[PDB]
């Protein structure tokens, strides 16, 4: 099925693959649709000589249906960023085998069992000993090398031009992250009646509304790096020794803190969900401490690794901090410490915004939704929401991730 | 004229005659009268001709593939003329009384035909040097700035429109790179392009390239210049980009335009008014000591910002239910919260404006492209004394701008200098 866009299912996919040498060659069929995400269709294909994943975008948001159109052109941006981020961090992104723009279809490496979505592992109370290492490396490489710390402004502008094409998905985010939680919307939902007052407070908080508008402006305006754009714990697949970032379909030239914040923010949601998963056998007290350690280490390793790349590449081609200006170790370290403190504050801000929108908005997270009892869920959700409102408003007071972790504990 | 060819006073006659949009404006198509054509471009980049016919007058501007003031050794795409013509039309639609009308654009020839801002219009910078007051200037410039910046921002654009507009203006990258070098980089290092009144400013230039706090601020502003698509900025809005009479104010030369930070325009303009203030003692004579004129400059600065602040807010209020998505009406949903976010936005905008303004002052004093305000002070030592006061003020302002809560406080600091 090739010449015009065709929505595929488990059996027409057979014919498409057979007609596509790049894909048929990779597996030489058992087909199962397994997409549990919000937007797209994903198929595991096996395979005489191998296996693969087929992802296809339809012209609307899958979790809503046809009343919410969304260009299938997002698949092009997903494939572009899987390749670009993959080039930079090949150990942490699934290889792309094939892209068909007409079909809005991507063929890519199947992340084989025992790979699971990280969010699920966090719900299950499983520790991932390489997670802080792998994720800090991924974020450092992808954000540093697509920033003006490495790009000259000619290539940066060329890349911005390209990614302005992903405006429809940017528009989805502008609505669901930066707008809906702060107003009345038929799309919003929360554990009710428990969080009714909580949701009203969010849409009546002036200081909160100021901060979200500033972050929304930065999202819409600031071409800082090629961000993944949806870097929550549902966008990471893991085993005890493998960490793979998937689903960069929301990618564009945006603020770095949006990725770091999405990821750290979702770890913070995991932390606040834990009490709702506690049992007689596992009270989650030690696991909660592990999550806090992973948050602290992810940021601290990221900071160290990002600066290491900057130091390694201080003598071009990036033009943001020209070496004959920032020309001794003292002034360079001074400007770096400033840059990283601002990046921490941006990250906490976007992280807090993502936490808020998960609790009162259209798209919730499994960490809380898998807590069956509404009352128990609401207690955990309220703790997370109170923390997130404080963080959004007060983040510039924090000098370190250690201070953020202390604040989480005092909540 | 199917291929690009540089025009001169003689060959332009033939170009006009082959071009109905031009010949008809001046009478060349129905009269045999000789056209009177004079090349008058005194700017840094392009060639500008005044054309006078029997029945009208016009200006022809042409870009060549290099920076005029440097010569062929500094290439610069002639495609800049496309961006100039685009922004003349776009800003002109928004502030029609303060931008010259475009009659003709020829992309191949990199050529614009536009309204001749006739005598006694002179460049504002020359009027400031001459000690001429312009009673309408704060009114006109504040309105010009509020209109051009508000209506091309996310307070008015939806993000689909904004992304489309950014895509287009990313093509003006070569001129952005010129500014990235000369404004944001060269003054803070050794460069063969840098120049200053020597030896008198040698220590001052060295201090700029040794000032860590200053280097931090310029890096953050450079990042904002390179990354932040806030509005369609003119991109070169100094006092040499404004032409004036007692009752007319016209903004010219938006060739550097792109989607950048609003403060870069406001700061370019106010920063050059501040340069003019600091140059005034250098132009003083026993007959006109410039003391009253200096106070006039300070009033115009204060009035320009204060009028801009309220007029920008007025457009925001007026378009609060309009298509802009930056501050959605059902979120910022009462008059009190809207004023609260507006006040913060405008404070940040003042700080951005003061930072870019200070950056432009610094680059005019130690960099490749100086201003007539100082260069027209004949005596080197006398010029350096005025230049130093300006530079010392600009360094303070770049570093300390966030302490200022009003333009009045900035004006007091200038008076304290
Ligand atoms: N390369 C892959 N290998 C294994 N499983 C995958 C792969 N890509 C996606 N999946 C599975 O498909 C689900 C949805 O994929 P995702 O790309 O997140 O789609 P959406 O864009 O709809 O969120 C994931 O939760 C995971 O279970
Ligand atoms: N529309 C106009 N009407 C009258 N004079 C003009 C007009 N446009 C330009 N000029 C004159 O040409 C000079 C240079 O024009 P400008 O557009 O600033 O060129 P540049 O891009 O080279 O700086 C101005 O200082 C002014 O004297
Ligand atoms: C209607 S919002 C859909 C959500 O799912 C995507 O993965 C993004 O997180 C988006 O906000
Ligand atoms: C080489 S710098 C030339 C200067 O003239 C233009 O008008 C801009 O101001 C530019 O910085
Ligand atoms: Cl999220
Ligand atoms: Cl200037
Ligand atoms: Mg997903
Ligand atoms: Mg997705
Ligand atoms: Mg000019
Ligand atoms: Mg000395
Ligand atoms: Mg010019």
Author numbering:
A (entry chain B): 2 to 29, 37 to 419
B (entry chain A): 3 to 419
Task: Give the article text.
The structure of Arabidopsis thaliana MTR kinase co-crystallized with ATPγS and MTR has been determined at 1.9 Å resolution. The A. thaliana MTR kinase complex was prepared by co-crystallization with excess but equal amount of ATPγS and MTR, but surprisingly, ADP and MTR were found in the active site. The structure of A. thaliana MTR kinase has two subunits in the asymmetric unit related by a non-crystallographic 2-fold. The nucleotide binds in the cleft region between the two lobes of the protein. In the A. thaliana MTR kinase structure, two Mg(II) ions assist in the binding of the ADP. In A. thaliana MTR kinase, MTR is bound in the higher energy α-ribofuranose anomer with the substrate's O1 hydroxyl cis to the O2 and O3 hydroxyl groups. The O1 and O2 oxygens of MTR form hydrogen bonds (~2.7 Å) with the carboxyl oxygens of D238 of the strictly conserved HGD-motif; while the O2 and O3 oxygens of MTR forms heteronuclear hydrogen bonds (~2.9 Å) with the guanidium nitrogens of R365 of the strictly conserved twin arginine RR-motif. The second arginine R366 does not interact directly with MTR but may facilitate the release of the anionic product, MTR 1-P. In the A. thaliana enzyme, a lysine (K362) is located near the RR-motif, and to mitigate the electrostatic repulsion between these three positively charged residues, a chloride ion is found interacting with K362. The G-loop of A. thaliana MTR kinase has an extended conformation, with interactions formed between N46 and the O4 oxygen of MTR. A consequence of this extended G-loop in the Arabidopsis enzyme is that it shields the active site from solvent, a feature that more closely resembles a eukaryotic protein kinase active site than that of the B. subtilis MTR kinase.
